[PDB]
Amino acid sequence: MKIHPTAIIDPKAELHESVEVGPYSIIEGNVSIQEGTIIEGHVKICAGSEIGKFNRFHQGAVIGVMPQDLGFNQQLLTKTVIGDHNIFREYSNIHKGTKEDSPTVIGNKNYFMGNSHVGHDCILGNNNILTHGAVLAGHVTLGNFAFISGLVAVHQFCFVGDYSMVAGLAKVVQDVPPYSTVDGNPSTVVGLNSVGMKRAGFSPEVRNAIKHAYKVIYHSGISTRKALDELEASGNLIEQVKYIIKFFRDSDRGVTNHR
Amino acid sequence: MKIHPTAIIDPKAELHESVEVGPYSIIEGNVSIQEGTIIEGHVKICAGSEIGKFNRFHQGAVIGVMPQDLGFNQQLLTKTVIGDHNIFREYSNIHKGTKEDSPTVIGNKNYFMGNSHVGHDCILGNNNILTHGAVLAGHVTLGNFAFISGLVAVHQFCFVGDYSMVAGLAKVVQDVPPYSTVDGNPSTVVGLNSVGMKRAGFSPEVRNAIKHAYKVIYHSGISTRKALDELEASGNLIEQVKYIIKFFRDSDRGVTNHR
Amino acid sequence: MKIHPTAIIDPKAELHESVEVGPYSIIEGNVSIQEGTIIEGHVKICAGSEIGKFNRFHQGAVIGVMPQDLGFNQQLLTKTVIGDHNIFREYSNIHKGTKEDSPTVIGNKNYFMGNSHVGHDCILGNNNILTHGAVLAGHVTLGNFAFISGLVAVHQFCFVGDYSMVAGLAKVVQDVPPYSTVDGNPSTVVGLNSVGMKRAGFSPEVRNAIKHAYKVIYHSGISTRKALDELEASGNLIEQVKYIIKFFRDSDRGVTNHR
Ligand SMILES: CCCCCCCCC[C@@H](O)CC(=O)N[C@H]1[C@H](O)[C@@H](CO)O[C@H](OP(=O)(O)OP(=O)(O)OC[C@H]2O[C@@H](n3ccc(=O)[nH]c3=O)[C@H](O)[C@@H]2O)[C@@H]1NC(C)=O
Ligand SMILES: CCCCCCCCC[C@@H](O)CC(=O)N[C@H]1[C@H](O)[C@@H](CO)O[C@H](OP(=O)(O)OP(=O)(O)OC[C@H]2O[C@@H](n3ccc(=O)[nH]c3=O)[C@H](O)[C@@H]2O)[C@@H]1NC(C)=O
Ligand SMILES: CCCCCCCCC[C@@H](O)CC(=O)N[C@H]1[C@H](O)[C@@H](CO)O[C@H](OP(=O)(O)OP(=O)(O)OC[C@H]2O[C@@H](n3ccc(=O)[nH]c3=O)[C@H](O)[C@@H]2O)[C@@H]1NC(C)=O
């Protein structure tokens, strides 16, 4: 329940009694911080921030700061929604939404390495890793268990599928498909994120069905449109594969070129 | 006119009366800060810094710090010259000059996104954008309205032309030509920065003349030297095109290869 | 001998009397800082940190922070060993070891530019340069006089040889061989780091023997295995060349592909 005396916390900020705030941190008004959340030193939590339970914010992390959008109205009250059990490492930088009804949303059990960045209006699910120095532009969506490696940049309006991986230094300009590994500049889909599926304990049967789905899509000499139709006409598919199909059809920017 | 009590500001620092300095910021001696400039928390403004009007320095921004030059004499009094209406985002990092008569110069209406870096002796004009995590080496020159995307690195002694764009993750080793888009590792000129010229309200006539100039240079099967001569012998050219020609001739490192 | 009043330093921390600690810095218990070491503002030195003589830690540098390893036990007492005459620039980030008997080790006369990162269990020798925004993963080893340029990422378990260079933006996934230059994504060995060998004052005879060694390895139409055997059967070799041979044989991940 210990808070450092040299912390500047607004009277109105709704901090749970268990919460810890370190030296020279600054918490603004219109802030909710729930149970078990530990804040270190020099952390800034900006107005609009709704932080859940058992999160950690390491030194210099900056939460709910202004959108890096030159057309954004700074007098607006916009939000940063953060779930439970997230870790924000040193100088990680999370920006709030650009509209009253579009917050920046982070789920549970995500890990933001030092100096990593989440732009305005990003939506992240659960158990994601954003590695050191990686930057998401505004309006980037991650599903669950995505691994984004160091110094990656993700273009605005891209989706990153569940259990996908993006290697160091990759320039992502289109969607990263589920269960897949993306790499390079220009980046391409390399193949399956097998290591991630195994780590996640996917049965060999599911992993093979995911493999067959992408064999059809990417390794059968037919267009993506025809490949998706073939998969469906094939009969009853597992939900992972239905998810792959949906992901391809709903894609806004399109899906990263295959290598 | 409000300054936070926990700020360490040198008595000699020349701050205007309107200026605002946030919690735990450190301003040194030999600092001039003009009217309307707002400084947030944990900002450091180093000796030699001449800051203009209506600038903003977000949390943790570091201004006029020592050159990352191992041969530089730290006892020297060198400057960081910053104009009006500039925005320096969280943990952005601006380094001072390496000589008494060569300051680091930033003009007006520039935007430095979080964790972006301007090396010693850089010269930047007006209305430029330095996107998140981007780094300019020492002695980098930007004109006006250059857009430099996220996690770009620019080599020392490169020039970046007006209304040019550099995409994520590009490794810039030679000049970025005016009105052009550069991308990749190794980077190349992709084509015209049409989006930027339109946004800037260039007439179709000017945009087409810029297009014709580069068609000759890059798309007519002739050497750059011959292409520039052809353009001039063509008669009276618009000033944008004369600027393109001058930019190519005055280039020190040469101009980025075309794709 | 001057320490700022607003610094939070643990009573148990073993700081030499000459040491300087700037405003709003935080030093923890179980910290040794030797003679002549200057710390600026907002620097954090974490438990386990053994800092030598005449080092400098610029504003916001974070030393001995927790490993970015999700399987690491945070209750463990692990170390960060730093030698003499090192410079850590603004917001540079050094992480401690993951085991009691495996510290993170930095030698002497190294330079860590702003926002550069050394992951858990890295071993660095002397006179190395880690340029702005560059990131080393955990278990990265650098020898002596390695120059690592801006925004480079180095994969876990890679070795970087003496007097080697890695250009901006390079994605390093295998070893960087001694006296060599590595570049790109995917990165390759470009050739010899001649500039670095000359700067270091290598005689033309040694530089030529290094050149001949790599000519055999990389420019004689024979496998690396055969090339190394040929070099040895050639007779008495200089120690630089023996070092090249050893480096290739002892390599864990293998050595970066040649261009
Ligand atoms: C181009 C290199 C970029 C380097 C960036 C360094 C950032 C700083 C990081 C450091 O500070 C902290 C420290 O580095 N953290 C890492 C730590 O060093 C490492 C221990 O060595 O454990 C993990 O690395 P992991 O690679 O996840 O486990 P491992 O090495 O056993 O797996 C080997 C291969 O598995 C593939 N793979 C893994 C997962 C997956 O889902 N799919 C997949 O194929 C990957 O491509 C990888 O090449 C930690 N997480 C991270 C994010 O690094
Ligand atoms: C490889 C991806 C790198 C991602 C790096 C993210 C950094 C963090 C950024 C976030 O935090 C904040 C947040 O991302 N800021 C951006 C914000 O998200 C976005 C709203 O979505 O508005 C702008 O993006 P813009 O791309 O300028 O406008 P828009 O998306 O409508 O234009 C589409 C295309 O126009 C081309 N183009 C644009 C200008 C030009 O002159 N020429 C040109 O061709 C570009 O190549 C681009 O692909 C904001 N500025 C910036 C710098 O991102
Ligand atoms: C892709 C560009 C990446 C830019 C990243 C900028 C980071 C911020 C940096 C700034 O803030 C601070 C500021 O930039 N620091 C640099 C400073 O600007 C510069 C003065 O201009 O002096 C040095 O640059 P150096 O390149 O070492 O000396 P020089 O320019 O005379 O050598 C030219 C060529 O030598 C080759 N070479 C050099 C050494 C070697 O061993 N082998 C080798 O071949 C390199 O590939 C290089 O292209 C300083 N060190 C650094 C690390 O930049």
mmCIF file of C-alpha atoms in Angstrom, chain C residues 72-236:
data_model
loop_
_atom_site.group_PDB
_atom_site.id
_atom_site.type_symbol
_atom_site.label_atom_id
_atom_site.label_comp_id
_atom_site.label_asym_id
_atom_site.label_seq_id
_atom_site.Cartn_x
_atom_site.Cartn_y
_atom_site.Cartn_z
ATOM 1 C CA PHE C 72 13.203 -15.169 -15.151
ATOM 2 C CA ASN C 73 12.750 -15.214 -11.366
ATOM 3 C CA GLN C 74 12.709 -11.568 -10.229
ATOM 4 C CA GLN C 75 13.568 -12.476 -6.610
ATOM 5 C CA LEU C 76 17.039 -13.625 -7.789
ATOM 6 C CA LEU C 77 20.151 -11.572 -7.064
ATOM 7 C CA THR C 78 21.880 -11.194 -10.413
ATOM 8 C CA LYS C 79 24.591 -8.788 -11.489
ATOM 9 C CA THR C 80 25.637 -6.105 -13.950
ATOM 10 C CA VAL C 81 29.444 -5.831 -14.143
ATOM 11 C CA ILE C 82 30.735 -2.617 -15.734
ATOM 12 C CA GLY C 83 34.437 -1.681 -16.066
ATOM 13 C CA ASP C 84 36.184 1.667 -16.453
ATOM 14 C CA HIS C 85 35.836 4.674 -18.746
ATOM 15 C CA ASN C 86 32.480 3.641 -20.250
ATOM 16 C CA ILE C 87 29.943 6.187 -21.453
ATOM 17 C CA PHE C 88 26.217 5.485 -21.228
ATOM 18 C CA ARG C 89 24.195 8.093 -23.105
ATOM 19 C CA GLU C 90 20.635 9.344 -22.506
ATOM 20 C CA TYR C 91 18.056 6.596 -21.904
ATOM 21 C CA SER C 92 20.523 3.804 -22.721
ATOM 22 C CA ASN C 93 19.294 0.605 -21.131
ATOM 23 C CA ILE C 94 21.450 -2.167 -19.630
ATOM 24 C CA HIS C 95 19.836 -5.312 -18.240
ATOM 25 C CA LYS C 96 21.307 -7.618 -15.580
ATOM 26 C CA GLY C 97 22.005 -11.342 -15.820
ATOM 27 C CA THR C 98 19.503 -14.152 -15.443
ATOM 28 C CA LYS C 99 21.670 -16.359 -13.194
ATOM 29 C CA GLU C 100 23.757 -15.813 -10.047
ATOM 30 C CA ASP C 101 26.923 -16.950 -11.905
ATOM 31 C CA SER C 102 26.091 -15.272 -15.250
ATOM 32 C CA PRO C 103 26.207 -11.469 -14.955
ATOM 33 C CA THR C 104 25.937 -8.969 -17.784
ATOM 34 C CA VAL C 105 29.547 -7.955 -18.417
ATOM 35 C CA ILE C 106 30.791 -4.702 -19.969
ATOM 36 C CA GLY C 107 34.548 -4.055 -20.055
ATOM 37 C CA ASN C 108 36.320 -0.731 -20.501
ATOM 38 C CA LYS C 109 36.107 2.253 -22.810
ATOM 39 C CA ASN C 110 32.755 1.319 -24.394
ATOM 40 C CA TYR C 111 30.257 3.834 -25.698
ATOM 41 C CA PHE C 112 26.527 3.288 -25.543
ATOM 42 C CA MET C 113 24.648 5.923 -27.555
ATOM 43 C CA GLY C 114 21.188 7.215 -26.597
ATOM 44 C CA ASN C 115 18.427 4.657 -26.367
ATOM 45 C CA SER C 116 20.768 1.742 -27.097
ATOM 46 C CA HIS C 117 20.092 -1.570 -25.382
ATOM 47 C CA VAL C 118 22.130 -4.440 -23.931
ATOM 48 C CA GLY C 119 20.014 -7.501 -23.084
ATOM 49 C CA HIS C 120 20.468 -9.917 -20.171
ATOM 50 C CA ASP C 121 23.716 -11.930 -20.060
ATOM 51 C CA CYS C 122 25.492 -10.021 -22.851
ATOM 52 C CA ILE C 123 29.297 -10.015 -22.696
ATOM 53 C CA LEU C 124 31.119 -7.020 -24.140
ATOM 54 C CA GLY C 125 34.887 -6.493 -24.175
ATOM 55 C CA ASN C 126 36.560 -3.102 -24.593
ATOM 56 C CA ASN C 127 36.357 -0.015 -26.836
ATOM 57 C CA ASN C 128 33.086 -1.060 -28.463
ATOM 58 C CA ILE C 129 30.534 1.379 -29.902
ATOM 59 C CA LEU C 130 26.818 0.698 -29.649
ATOM 60 C CA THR C 131 25.177 3.376 -31.819
ATOM 61 C CA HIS C 132 21.842 5.160 -31.281
ATOM 62 C CA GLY C 133 18.780 2.943 -30.956
ATOM 63 C CA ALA C 134 20.758 -0.306 -31.464
ATOM 64 C CA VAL C 135 19.570 -3.372 -29.548
ATOM 65 C CA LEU C 136 21.429 -6.463 -28.461
ATOM 66 C CA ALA C 137 19.287 -9.414 -27.449
ATOM 67 C CA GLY C 138 20.212 -11.510 -24.433
ATOM 68 C CA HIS C 139 23.427 -13.555 -24.642
ATOM 69 C CA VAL C 140 25.104 -11.386 -27.276
ATOM 70 C CA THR C 141 28.929 -11.316 -27.169
ATOM 71 C CA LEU C 142 31.077 -8.495 -28.517
ATOM 72 C CA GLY C 143 34.862 -8.611 -28.593
ATOM 73 C CA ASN C 144 36.973 -5.464 -28.718
ATOM 74 C CA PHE C 145 36.591 -2.363 -30.897
ATOM 75 C CA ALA C 146 33.370 -3.554 -32.556
ATOM 76 C CA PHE C 147 31.397 -0.760 -34.169
ATOM 77 C CA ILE C 148 27.653 -1.409 -34.198
ATOM 78 C CA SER C 149 25.766 1.263 -36.135
ATOM 79 C CA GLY C 150 22.346 2.841 -35.527
ATOM 80 C CA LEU C 151 19.117 0.848 -35.173
ATOM 81 C CA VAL C 152 20.863 -2.519 -35.627
ATOM 82 C CA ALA C 153 19.278 -5.593 -33.971
ATOM 83 C CA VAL C 154 21.460 -8.527 -32.854
ATOM 84 C CA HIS C 155 19.950 -11.975 -32.258
ATOM 85 C CA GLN C 156 20.575 -13.898 -29.013
ATOM 86 C CA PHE C 157 23.779 -16.043 -28.900
ATOM 87 C CA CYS C 158 25.550 -14.206 -31.728
ATOM 88 C CA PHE C 159 29.218 -13.260 -31.439
ATOM 89 C CA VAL C 160 30.532 -10.023 -32.921
ATOM 90 C CA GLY C 161 34.308 -10.245 -33.739
ATOM 91 C CA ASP C 162 37.033 -7.635 -32.966
ATOM 92 C CA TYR C 163 37.233 -4.563 -35.234
ATOM 93 C CA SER C 164 34.080 -5.565 -37.057
ATOM 94 C CA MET C 165 31.425 -3.146 -38.271
ATOM 95 C CA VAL C 166 27.673 -3.543 -38.583
ATOM 96 C CA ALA C 167 25.957 -0.824 -40.751
ATOM 97 C CA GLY C 168 22.596 0.980 -39.911
ATOM 98 C CA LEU C 169 19.603 -1.063 -39.852
ATOM 99 C CA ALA C 170 21.179 -4.409 -40.259
ATOM 100 C CA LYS C 171 19.372 -7.485 -38.987
ATOM 101 C CA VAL C 172 22.066 -9.702 -37.456
ATOM 102 C CA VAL C 173 21.082 -13.334 -37.053
ATOM 103 C CA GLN C 174 24.510 -15.045 -37.174
ATOM 104 C CA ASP C 175 28.031 -14.134 -36.081
ATOM 105 C CA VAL C 176 29.772 -11.010 -37.353
ATOM 106 C CA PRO C 177 33.314 -12.215 -38.263
ATOM 107 C CA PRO C 178 36.469 -10.360 -37.063
ATOM 108 C CA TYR C 179 37.731 -7.368 -39.115
ATOM 109 C CA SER C 180 34.617 -7.585 -41.330
ATOM 110 C CA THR C 181 31.668 -5.376 -42.311
ATOM 111 C CA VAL C 182 28.115 -6.709 -42.138
ATOM 112 C CA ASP C 183 25.057 -5.033 -43.649
ATOM 113 C CA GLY C 184 21.422 -5.467 -44.604
ATOM 114 C CA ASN C 185 18.173 -7.310 -44.097
ATOM 115 C CA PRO C 186 18.883 -10.135 -44.649
ATOM 116 C CA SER C 187 22.407 -9.135 -43.612
ATOM 117 C CA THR C 188 25.586 -10.343 -45.300
ATOM 118 C CA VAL C 189 29.290 -9.918 -44.913
ATOM 119 C CA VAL C 190 30.089 -7.104 -47.324
ATOM 120 C CA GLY C 191 33.871 -7.252 -47.056
ATOM 121 C CA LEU C 192 36.683 -6.105 -44.784
ATOM 122 C CA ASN C 193 36.346 -3.352 -42.198
ATOM 123 C CA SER C 194 39.390 -1.618 -43.737
ATOM 124 C CA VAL C 195 38.517 1.811 -42.329
ATOM 125 C CA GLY C 196 38.478 0.295 -38.814
ATOM 126 C CA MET C 197 41.741 -1.625 -39.247
ATOM 127 C CA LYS C 198 43.497 1.490 -40.621
ATOM 128 C CA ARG C 199 42.053 3.693 -37.852
ATOM 129 C CA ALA C 200 43.366 1.112 -35.376
ATOM 130 C CA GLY C 201 46.818 1.454 -36.993
ATOM 131 C CA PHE C 202 47.100 -2.118 -38.324
ATOM 132 C CA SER C 203 50.161 -2.393 -40.576
ATOM 133 C CA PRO C 204 49.432 -3.008 -44.292
ATOM 134 C CA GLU C 205 51.087 -6.453 -43.832
ATOM 135 C CA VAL C 206 48.573 -7.536 -41.150
ATOM 136 C CA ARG C 207 45.653 -6.007 -43.060
ATOM 137 C CA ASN C 208 46.810 -7.901 -46.174
ATOM 138 C CA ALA C 209 47.136 -11.170 -44.261
ATOM 139 C CA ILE C 210 43.592 -10.616 -42.957
ATOM 140 C CA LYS C 211 42.597 -9.928 -46.592
ATOM 141 C CA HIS C 212 44.281 -13.141 -47.795
ATOM 142 C CA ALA C 213 42.637 -15.163 -45.001
ATOM 143 C CA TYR C 214 39.180 -14.001 -46.140
ATOM 144 C CA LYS C 215 40.098 -14.389 -49.827
ATOM 145 C CA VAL C 216 40.649 -18.087 -49.128
ATOM 146 C CA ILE C 217 37.482 -18.343 -46.981
ATOM 147 C CA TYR C 218 35.155 -16.336 -49.196
ATOM 148 C CA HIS C 219 36.705 -15.766 -52.633
ATOM 149 C CA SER C 220 38.378 -19.035 -53.719
ATOM 150 C CA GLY C 221 35.390 -21.219 -54.712
ATOM 151 C CA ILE C 222 35.843 -23.670 -51.821
ATOM 152 C CA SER C 223 33.750 -24.553 -48.760
ATOM 153 C CA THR C 224 34.432 -22.778 -45.468
ATOM 154 C CA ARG C 225 35.612 -26.094 -43.937
ATOM 155 C CA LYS C 226 38.154 -26.633 -46.702
ATOM 156 C CA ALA C 227 39.187 -22.951 -46.597
ATOM 157 C CA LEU C 228 40.099 -23.106 -42.895
ATOM 158 C CA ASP C 229 42.120 -26.312 -43.415
ATOM 159 C CA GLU C 230 43.985 -24.692 -46.315
ATOM 160 C CA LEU C 231 44.894 -21.690 -44.180
ATOM 161 C CA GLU C 232 46.357 -23.900 -41.426
ATOM 162 C CA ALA C 233 48.287 -26.211 -43.759
ATOM 163 C CA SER C 234 49.712 -22.964 -45.214
ATOM 164 C CA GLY C 235 52.162 -22.786 -42.298
ATOM 165 C CA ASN C 236 52.725 -20.188 -39.581
#
